[PDB]
Write a protein that binds this ligand. Structure first.
Ligand SMILES: CC(C)(C)c1ccc(CSc2cnn(C(C)(C)C)c(=O)c2Cl)cc1
Ligand code: SF4
Ligand code: SF4
Ligand code: SF4
Ligand code: SF4
Ligand code: SF4
Ligand code: FES
Lengths: 166, 384, 196, 240, 127, 180, 127
């Protein structure tokens, strides 16, 4: 029941969800290859708990928006995001997803927070694979409830808990 | 069964939608649906100075991008008649063949993983990292590197680039020969690839399937021989070909292309003699960074070039090149302004994809995956 | 070689030949003669159709006959049966209020997708197309992006305290018709070309 | 009306037309410092030089096309190699003593000198031979800097190339002689004993100065010219 | 040769002299212009002791009455020059070793500079 | 060709007993090349004056338009830049920045020059606009790194190592080849 | 295309929008919530452009929490659009200097601009 209502139990389940981040592959653009390189045999996102990679949205919690989110893919991704279990986290990978990138035009959503609740933002073009590990570590200590912004605020464990989805 | 292999699923690389008209386990015909990544490079490029568009060029075909860089550079140069020093051109062809190696590595890793086993994805992709390290040495960027310029290249090579490159040129032939020893005497991959993928050269031509799979159908049609631009006239060159268009001959040709590319790298690097790096014509190349504290004219040209840029003559231009996916070119219309009037890209994977309903027609449902991977599509190229 | 024979065939037919000193050839055909001429062009052995590039000449400083201009690219593969290697372009202007052009689907199937893109990017409808379905832009998108009267749709870049930038009013680089920040543009910035 | 030829083109033109104006009217171009719209032209910057044939009988020396009248059926050559050579030479002479302040110059991209220089300078002298921008390797002219001539106007006497636009204006357009040179030769610099800038039309020279010598003090150090968001409108303070 | 250094060094001294005068007579001294090969040096080295190339002594109205300039790090015929605005008065100072700073052959003493600046204050300044 | 299955087994085992190749970031610092495109830095002269003379060339040549420069006039008594102009406000949106290097290539004073840090992921958009005093060469680390050093009491640890820092990065503090 | 409501009057604009909306079927209509300042929704203001396909409707910058009680009105508004069958919600980001003049442009320019620049939005962010 939501991972709450005991001081030890919420710490425990937050620990589990933090290190057991099961990525949901959503490769969009050239960010995708520097995403996969965070799993190659120089630098693997295969230690923290993300070795296995369930392409299914019904089985993976972290959605890595790796590339430009073109508008014709937005509504589809929409349902794909709703086709995730509720304990889900959404990372915005790359400049084109986090921001509009250099493609300031009619074609691209200029910030993916519009359609999906973003957990962590990561600048870069392409973000070095180790920066992707840094972003998942950021998300790690966020879902543990150990993350603070520049204004001093603690951030909720799971973004996408605060939106009247519909 | 009008089955919807939807966008990005199941793990269909190169976000793409496929409406497989299919009864059973065969493949009647696949109706493709693309457009899921169209960002508008042909449009956004109309609003960036000639110097800036080099930042838009690589990010479209993000695997073999230096073909983009070089084609755009050559088109603009021919438009304004700039001279690339021989050392600059040689470095350009070295980087071209190197990104070709990286591209083919990623292509075969993705293909092998696509159906079958996962393991060999790593080793080949491993080399990519080393290759990327090489690039990170010179361009300071893994990919999307902003190095090339209209006159030539941004700046010089460090002393540290050549040794790492020689080390890789020593390990690569053994590595590629290992993959080929694994592959050529294929136990199942033989019964998986040799028969599949009917590529009648007449149809591959009618649909313009240039992406290296046409020579698997036995058409020796390569720009490196057909239309020498960057000194390929000066290279000892094997142009691999396939007897019958299938997956197996395609893959063998691509591997021999990798080895010959390594040989081209050796050849180019060996002939490397000191010299200049780009066309010093100030309208074409920004002033050298050292005399910014000496001349007014220096400040004027630097300021204007980095704010306005330069204005090439009124005219239209095109230059083709050979990408890891076939014939490429830029139709660039310049109106005498600091920004190009229009930039159209001949996207090789875009025309090459028309051969999917034909190719995967009658093949099996699983083989529809390999027959896509055999084509090596990059949807950043296609949707564009 | 077949390019030279195209030249000796067309020049007698009154078709102007546009050439820049770079080695690229344009042959302008009118609307009607286009279809049968290019049917003969395939019959002449032009297997390979590389490009179909759409052009909006609206914002070009010098005026042109018509707003839209469609250019096909015909080639002959050097390594096939009879390989010359002749590659050249065919330009055909298309009226702004009459975006008609017969398809070359019957000759090449390659123009299946390519022409569609021009119907997506421009208001050009290609007659004789198997299926003119919008390829790239979203289905609910209204209009044709690449024509100059269609906005690029820029969105400002953001900063800390109310400080923003609107790029189209920010760009210092000048297009062809923008005279510049001085009274005018002359000399090199009205066109510059070095002499080898 | 009178017939003129610019390098390949024929133009009908009324008689009182300046050769420079007819050249622009044919669509051609020439550097311009001395002459200005609605200002009395005098060949000073010697930038407008063209070739003139008056029969093919070329003039002995180059005529100042800014202040040279036109005759019926006169040939004008602005593309001769010698013409561009002379124009680049005059541009180099003009750029000789500028203070190297473009990056901190609030006139930024909108400097007529910058654009004419990037247009006509450095003719391709005759390979990938190493080009040199400047030959003058001596000490440049240095005078008083950023002197506010008035609570509205700033004066940087270094950047002045000694055209006549500001003093010619002040004499002709307002009729308030509140600005003129001090010394002569190369030491010439602008000064006044009328400091408040009495004329209520003082600000317009701010726009005319093709260099960043005279600037708008109230807009000093806010943004570069191309960075500003331009909206043309009409001033409704008074009924004109 | 290397005398350049002491020249620039002596140049600093000249500026020092200038400042003293300004502080005595209660007149505004203003740093007019710095070294370009020091502003526009990005990674390049800079060996000069100061960054300032041109300065002046300005009256209350801002019009200078005494102007001083020194040749840059990279220019030929390095010198120091002096000027009186409105007075067609120009001086060419060098630095000769052992003797000192020279106007031609006449050494440039601090009190000479003070007398010139005082004459300027009385004569040229409007207020 | 049944032998190939056995050969595949053999090569996979050979690579099995070949244990090493990987680097465990963040436990092992990534070796970055000296030319890498990283977090911008604003550099200072030896004199202590800041190098930025606020000329808006980095903002004009920025193809992504992420650079905004509000200028101001040096105060002669306590100058900040070397000329008569300095950058009162220099903010860069790392989410817009595409990491070209044109800002460095246009900077005539070498003030704005790309650095090396890549550990810049943060949670909120409006917090990813790095400010001048968040990129000056004086500082040691990225924004989330500094914030963690405050909320943690643990000093900043950079997760990268480079053979050396370029001359254009004079002052740039980094681990250098192991001399320390 | 109609224009109903006024600036900075969430309740008046909302009630006029209820009345003028009626039983309009929005199965293929498009809703553009134009705003400024992409990120900071905490103080955001919102205008609405409703393109039904057969006729269009404009409401100026009168919605959003930037106005007192504007979020409650915006909540009712999005709930209303969702009730009538809307599926496609869009947000366009324009400069504050644009938003005000934009409502004075001809219908074709305003509508073309907005439909061109739109960003697909999750309506949940405004509930
Ligand atoms: C399991 C891994 C993480 C390796 C995995 C993750 C995601 C995908 C599907 S995204 C994708 C993948 N490759 N390509 C190329 C450029 C190679 C054609 C794409 O264009 C796209 Cl869009 C596949 C595998
Ligand atoms: S941020 Fe760069 S690497 Fe990532 S999708 Fe955009 S262009 Fe590609
Ligand atoms: S101050 Fe300007 S307008 Fe006046 S003479 Fe000098 S350059 Fe001409
Ligand atoms: S007046 Fe012109 S040439 Fe002089 S510093 Fe300013 S912009 Fe540069
Ligand atoms: S590297 Fe970043 S700040 Fe520099 S020009 Fe490119 S986008 Fe702009
Ligand atoms: S280019 Fe350099 S000196 Fe100019 S504003 Fe940018 S950081 Fe400052
Ligand atoms: S233009 Fe000044 S001399 Fe004629």
């Amino acid at each position: 029941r939501e991972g709450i209502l005991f001081t030890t139990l919420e710490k425990l389940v937050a620990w589990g969800r933090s290190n057991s981040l099961w990525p949901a592959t959503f490769g969009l653009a050239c960010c995708a290859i520097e995403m996969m390189a965070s799993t190659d045999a120089r630098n693997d996102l295969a230690r923290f708990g993300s070795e296995v990679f369930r392409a299914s949205p019904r089985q993976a919690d972290v959605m890595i928006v790796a590339g430009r989110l073109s508008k014709k893919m937005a509504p589809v991704m929409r349902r794909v995001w709703e086709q995730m279990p509720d304990p889900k986290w959404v990372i915005s990978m790359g400049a084109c997803a986090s921001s509009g990138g250099m493609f300031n035009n009619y074609a691209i959503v200029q910030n993916v927070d519009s359609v999906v609740p973003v957990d962590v933002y990561v600048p870069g073009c392409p973000p070095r694979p180790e920066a992707l590990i840094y972003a998942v570590m950021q998300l790690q200590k966020k879902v543990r409830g150990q993350a603070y912004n520049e204004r001093g605020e603690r951030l909720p464990p799971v973004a996408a808990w605060k939106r009247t989805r519909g | 069964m009008t089955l919807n292999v939807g966008p990005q699923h199941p793990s269909t690389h190169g976000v793409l939608r496929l409406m497989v008209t299919l009864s059973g386990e065969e493949v009647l015909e696949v109706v493709p649906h693309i457009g899921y990544l169209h960002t508008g490079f042909e449009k956004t490029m109309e609003h960036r100075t000639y110097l800036q568009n080099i930042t838009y060029t690589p990010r479209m075909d993000y695997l073999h991008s230096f073909a983009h860089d070089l084609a755009y550079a050559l088109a603009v140069e021919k438009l304004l008649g700039a001279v690339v020093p021989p050392r600059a051109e040689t470095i350009r062809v070295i980087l071209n063949e190197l990104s070709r190696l990286a591209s083919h590595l990623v292509f075969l890793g993705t293909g092998l993983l696509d159906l079958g086993a996962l393991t060999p994805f790593f080793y080949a992709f491993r080399e990519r990292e080393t290759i990327l390290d090489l690039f990170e040495w010179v361009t300071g960027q893994r990919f999307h590197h902003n190095y090339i310029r209209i006159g030539g290249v941004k700046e010089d090579l460090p002393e540290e680039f050549v040794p790492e490159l020689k080390k890789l040129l020593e390990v690569l032939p053994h590595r590629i020969d290992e993959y080929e020893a694994l592959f050529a005497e294929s136990p199942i991959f033989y019964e998986r690839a040799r028969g599949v993928g009917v590529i009648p050269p007449e149809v591959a031509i009618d649909l313009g399937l240039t992406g290296g799979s046409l020579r698997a159908s036995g058409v020796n049609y390569d720009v490196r021989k057909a239309y020498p631009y960057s000194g390929y006239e000066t290279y000892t060159f094997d142009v691999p070909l396939g007897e019958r268009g299938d997956v197996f001959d395609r893959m063998l040709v691509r591997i021999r292309e990798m080895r010959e590319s390594v040989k081209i790298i050796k050849q180019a690097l060996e002939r490397l003699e000191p010299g200049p790096v780009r066309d010093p014509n100030p309208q074409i190349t920004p002033p050298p960074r050292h005399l910014l504290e000496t001349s007014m004219e220096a400040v004027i040209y630097h300021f204007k070039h980095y704010t306005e840029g330069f204005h090439p003559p009124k005219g239209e231009v095109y230059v083709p090149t050979e990408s890891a996916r076939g014939e490429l070119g830029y139709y660039i219309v310049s109106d005498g302004g600091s920004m190009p009037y229009r930039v159209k890209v001949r996207a090789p994977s875009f025309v090459n994809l028309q051969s999917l309903p034909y190719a995967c027609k009658g093949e099996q449902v699983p083989d529809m995956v390999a027959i896509i991977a055999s084509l090596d599509p990059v949807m950043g190229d296609v949707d564009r | 070689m077949r390019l030279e024979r195209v030249l000796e065939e067309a020049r007698a037919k009154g078709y102007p030949i546009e050439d820049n000193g770079l080695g690229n050839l344009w042959v302008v055909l009118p609307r009607e003669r286009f279809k049968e001429e290019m049917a003969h062009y395939k019959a002449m052995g032009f297997n390979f159709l590389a490009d179909i590039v759409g052009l909006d000449y609206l914002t070009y400083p010098d005026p042109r006959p018509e707003r839209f201009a469609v250019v096909y690219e015909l080639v002959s593969l050097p390594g096939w049966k009879d390989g010359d290697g002749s590659r050249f372009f065919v330009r055909v202007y298309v009226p702004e209020e009459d975006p008609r052009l017969p398809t070359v689907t019957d000759l090449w199937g390659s123009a299946n997708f390519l022409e569609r893109e021009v119907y997506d990017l421009f208001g050009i409808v290609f007659e004789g197309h198997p299926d003119l379905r919008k390829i790239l832009t979203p289905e609910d998108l209204e209009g044709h992006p690449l024509r100059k009267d269609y906005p690029l749709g820029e969105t400002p870049t953001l900063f800390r305290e109310g400080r923003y930038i609107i790029p189209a009013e920010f760009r210092a680089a000048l297009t062809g018709k923008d005279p510049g920040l001085t009274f005018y543009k002359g000399g090199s910035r009205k066109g510059y070309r070095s002499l080898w | 009306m009178v017939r003129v030829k610019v390098n390949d083109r024929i133009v009908e033109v009324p008689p009182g037309t300046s050769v420079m104006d007819a050249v622009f009217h044919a669509g051609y171009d020439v550097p311009l410092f001395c002459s200005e719209k609605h200002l009395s032209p005098i060949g000073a910057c010697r930038m407008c030089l063209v070739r003139i044939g008056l029969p093919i009988q070329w003039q002995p020396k180059l005529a100042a096309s800014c202040v040279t009248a036109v005759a019926d059926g006169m040939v004008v050559d602005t593309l001769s190699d010698v013409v561009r050579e002379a124009q680049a030479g005059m541009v180099e002479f003009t750029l000789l003593n500028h203070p190297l302040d473009c990056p901190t110059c609030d006139k930024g991209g909108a400097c007529e000198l910058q654009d004419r220089t990037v247009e006509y300078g450095l003719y391709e002298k005759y390979p990938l031979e190493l080009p040199v921008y400047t030959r003058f390797e001596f000490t440049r002219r240095h005078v008083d800097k950023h002197h506010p001539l008035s609570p509205f106007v700033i004066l940087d006497r270094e950047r002045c190339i000694h055209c006549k636009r500001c003093v010619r204006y002040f004499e002709e357009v307002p009729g308030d002689e509140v600005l003129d040179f001090i010394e002569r030769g190369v030491h010439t610099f602008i000064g006044t004993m009328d400091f408040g800038l009495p004329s209520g039309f003082s600000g317009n020279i701010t726009d005319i100065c093709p260099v960043g010598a005279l600037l708008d003090l109230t807009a000093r150090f806010r943004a570069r010219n191309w960075e500003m968001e331009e909206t043309p409108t009409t001033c409704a303070l008074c009924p004109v | 040769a290397s005398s350049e250094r002491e020249l620039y060094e002596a140049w600093v001294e000249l500026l020092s002299w200038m400042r003293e005068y300004a502080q005595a007579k209660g007149v505004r001294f203003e740093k007019e212009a710095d070294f370009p090969d020091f502003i526009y040096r990005m990674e390049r080295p800079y060996d000069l002791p100061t960054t300032i190339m041109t300065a002046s002594l300005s009256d209350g109205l801002g019009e200078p009455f005494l102007l001083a300039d020194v040749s840059p790090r990279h220019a030929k015929l390095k010198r120091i020059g002096l000027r009186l605005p409105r007075a067609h008065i120009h001086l060419h100072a060098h630095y000769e070793p052992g003797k000192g700073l020279v106007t031609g052959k006449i050494p440039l003493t601090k009190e000479r500079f003070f007398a010139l600046a005082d004459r300027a204050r009385e004569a040229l300044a409007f207020a | 060709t049944l032998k190939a299955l056995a050969q595949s087994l053999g090569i996979t085992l050979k690579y099995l007993f070949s244990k090493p190749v990987t680097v465990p970031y963040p436990d092992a610092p990534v070796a970055l090349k000296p030319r890498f495109h990283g977090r911008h830095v604003l550099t200072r002269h030896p004199n202590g004056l800041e190098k930025c003379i606020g000329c808006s060339l980095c903002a004009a040549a920025c193809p992504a338009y992420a650079i905004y420069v509000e200028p101001a006039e040096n105060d002669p008594e306590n100058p900040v830049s070397a000329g008569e102009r300095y950058a009162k406000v220099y903010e860069i949106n790392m989410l817009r920045c595409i990491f070209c290097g044109l800002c460095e290539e246009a900077c005539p004073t070498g003030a704005i020059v790309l650095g090396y840090d890549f550990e810049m992921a943060d949670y909120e958009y409006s917090d990813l606009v790095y400010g001048k005093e968040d990129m000056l060469v004086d500082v040691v680390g990225t924004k989330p790194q500094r914030r963690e050093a405050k909320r943690t009491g643990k000093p900043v640890k950079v997760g990268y190592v480079v053979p050396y820092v370029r001359p254009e990065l004079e002052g740039f503090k980094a681990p250098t080849e192991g001399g320390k | 295309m109609v224009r109903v409501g006024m600036r900075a009057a969430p309740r008046v604009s909302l009630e006029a929008l209820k009345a003028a909306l009626g039983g309009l079927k929005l199965s293929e209509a498009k809703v553009y919530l134009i705003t400024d300042w992409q990120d900071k929704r905490d103080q955001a203001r919102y205008a609405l452009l409703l393109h039904t396909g057969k006729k269009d409707l404009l409401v100026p910058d009168a919605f959003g929490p930037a106005f007192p009680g504007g979020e409650e009105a915006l909540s009712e508004l999005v709930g209303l659009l969702l009730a009538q069958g809307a599926r496609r919600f869009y947000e366009a980001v324009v400069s504050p200097g644009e938003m005000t003049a934009l409502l004075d442009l001809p219908p074709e320019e305003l509508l073309k601009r907005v439909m061109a620049i739109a960003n697909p939005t999750d309506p949940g962010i405004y509930l």
